[PDB]
């Protein structure tokens, strides 16, 4: 909440999301989010309370 944000980052997230699976995609999402702390800090704070680091019994 310390500064403003821009709607261009939301469009950059969508163009990045549509790319094929790669470690570069993860880096681009982090790059885009770090430019706008306001929404990413609220998102991680909401997510950590509901985070799941494993999977159930499947085959």
């Amino acid at each position: 909440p310390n500064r403003s944000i821009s709607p261009s980052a939301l469009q950059d997230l969508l163009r990045t999301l549509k790319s094929p699976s790669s470690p570069q995609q993860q880096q681009q999402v982090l790059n885009i989010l770090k430019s706008n702390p306001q929404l990413m800090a609220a998102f991680i704070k909401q997510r950590t309370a509901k985070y799941v680091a494993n999977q159930p019994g499947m085959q």
Binding site: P7, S21, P37, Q46
Partner: protein
């Protein structure tokens, strides 16, 4: 071209005005997101395919 149900309005619903967790944004020390959660907030778009 979009609705109040898409990711652009889901940002507003986040706890940007509260404190829930016992620690700040530095929580990513042992956890990092996956694309399965990133493809969730845009799926509400009222468009074709």
């Amino acid at each position: 071209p979009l609705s109040q149900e898409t990711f652009s309005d889901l940002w507003k619903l986040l706890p940007e005005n509260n404190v829930l967790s016992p620690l700040p944004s530095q929580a990513m020390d042992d956890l990092m997101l996956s694309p399965d959660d990133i493809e969730q907030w845009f799926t509400e778009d009222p468009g074709p395919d």
